[PDB]
């Protein structure tokens, strides 16, 4: 339909993808580093979620260079997405209420 509305949803599908590839890539990068805890897929997915939302509790975090780079991408994707939905809600509210005048 509307650009902003489409870009938002596209941002959401893209998010889910980054979340999954994030889980895969994180484990791939962290495994091999002594003491690393981001080493099994199920928890790595939960790590990805709390990173993308930025709640970073943490209970798990990358410690290798590539794990951190993967973390940086997930952070930005999550922030961009959640930020692309706010702009879509602002476009909807503005354009709309503009009629209520």
């Amino acid at each position, epitope marked *: 339909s509307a650009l902003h509305w489409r870009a938002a949803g596209a941002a959401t599908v893209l998010l889910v993808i980054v979340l999954l590839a994030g889980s895969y890539l994180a*484990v*791939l990068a962290e*495994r*091999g580093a*002594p003491g*690393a*805890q981001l*080493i*099994t*897929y199920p928890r790595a997915l939960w790590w990805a979620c709390e990173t993308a939302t930025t709640v970073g509790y943490x209970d798990l975090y990358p410690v290798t260079l590539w794990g951190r780079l993967v973390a940086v991408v997930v952070m930005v994707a999550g922030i961009t997405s959640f930020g692309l939905v706010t702009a879509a809600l602002a476009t909807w509210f503005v354009g709309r209420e503009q009629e209520r005048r």
Partner: antibody
Amino acid sequence: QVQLQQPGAELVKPGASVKLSCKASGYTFTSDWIHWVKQRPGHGLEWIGEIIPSYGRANYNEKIQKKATLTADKSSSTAFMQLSSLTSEDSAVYYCARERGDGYFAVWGAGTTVTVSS
Amino acid sequence: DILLTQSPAILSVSPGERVSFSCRASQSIGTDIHWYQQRTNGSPRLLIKYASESISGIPSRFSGSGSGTDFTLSINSVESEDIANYYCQQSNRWPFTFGSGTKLEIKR
């Protein structure tokens, strides 16, 4: 159907080299890691290393000399471990096991008995 | 690198009794512990995963408990087929590691 198939035994002369194999069956996912565990007679289990076939990357135990090199062949679904410059010390039973990226070893191979003698 | 300690190394029990093996982690690992069985001339067999979760195809006799650094694998009423070597393994931190081992022995 036996999930992992390994040659029953291998003989190697000191200083020589042998390449063990492990053919897998059943379901196969991108999240599969194949591990190699070494067991000397009368003793316990010793993690040697791991490899992720879908990507081809492997990691090895730092607390021990690196006699092994891991490789994988996607087409024939076989994982190989190249043991080099052996000695009586490298003589034991080598297992391969599969892990679904969740931390435990679901299934093991029968194990390949390796002997280093002249 | 997490050090898993299993003591004692040999456990002797009377048929039908209740036996308990213990694993000691050198640092908190949650419940990221798993147990294996290896009979003579055999290969390891997963018995319990994640400290408590039961595996499919394993007698309801086998159970596990613990969290942090202290874990226990129990057998309610042990029997002959249980004579073997039990090992624990952690997946909390890299690299995965194995316990030294515990042998179960029956006194008939």
